[PDB]
């Protein structure tokens, strides 16, 4: 491993705006229907075991890629979740969803 893989942060929280990489650009997730099940799926992708949804975390820019995300909670990826068409939203970045992963 690189040295970069020989450090880690344990027993705390990673909290912030949830972003997703689609069509070669980072974009954000509207908080419409964004819930703990969605947050857990998102956080699982980063190797965490639980996510809590933070409504209207805000602060993003550019594309809003996802809206009305409706995960069962058991998906390995947001790509497996039911949601609006990618890039189909009626949102602004004040509504950008966040997560507290742990």
């Amino acid at each position: 491993a690189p040295l970069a893989q020989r450090v880690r942060i344990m027993g705390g929280t990673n909290r912030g705006r949830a972003e997703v990489y689609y069509n070669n650009e980072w974009g954000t997730i509207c908080d419409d229907d964004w819930d703990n099940n969605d947050a857990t799926v998102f956080c699982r992708m980063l190797g965490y075991s639980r996510g809590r949804a933070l409504s209207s975390y805000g602060g993003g820019s550019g594309n809003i890629w996802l809206d009305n995300v409706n995960c069962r909670g058991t998906e390995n990826s947001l790509w497996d979740c039911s949601k609006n068409s990618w890039g189909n939203h009626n949102c602004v970045h004040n509504e950008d969803a966040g997560v507290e992963c742990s």
Side-chain angles (χ1 to χ4, degrees):
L3 289 179
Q5 297 170 16
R6 295 177 67 164
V7 291
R8 71 186 188 167
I9 299 168
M10 292 300 277
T13 55
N14 189 349
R15 175 184 187 98
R17 178 178 58 259
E19 296 189 359
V20 63
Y21 193 78
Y22 172 92
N23 204 32
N24 311 296
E25 294 188 277
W26 290 104
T28 63
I29 300 174
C30 187
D31 73 0
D32 294 339
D33 298 330
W34 181 254
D35 68 11
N36 287 338
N37 287 334
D38 301 325
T40 296
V41 175
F42 176 96
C43 294
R44 173 177 298 143
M45 295 177 70
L46 294 170
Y48 298 95
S49 71
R50 191 187 74 191
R52 290 176 57 248
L54 309 174
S55 176
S56 298
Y57 191 94
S61 66
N63 288 286
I64 300 165
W65 286 136
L66 294 175
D67 190 14
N68 306 113
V69 183
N70 278 281
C71 299
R72 294 171 286 284
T74 57
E75 299 86 343
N76 299 126
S77 168
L78 284 182
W79 272 247
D80 291 310
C81 299
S82 178
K83 60 217 179 298
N84 275 192
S85 295
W86 289 90
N88 179 212
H89 68 89
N90 54 358
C91 299
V92 297
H93 286 283
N94 273 339
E95 305 175 275
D96 288 340
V99 295
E100 183 192 74
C101 303
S102 66

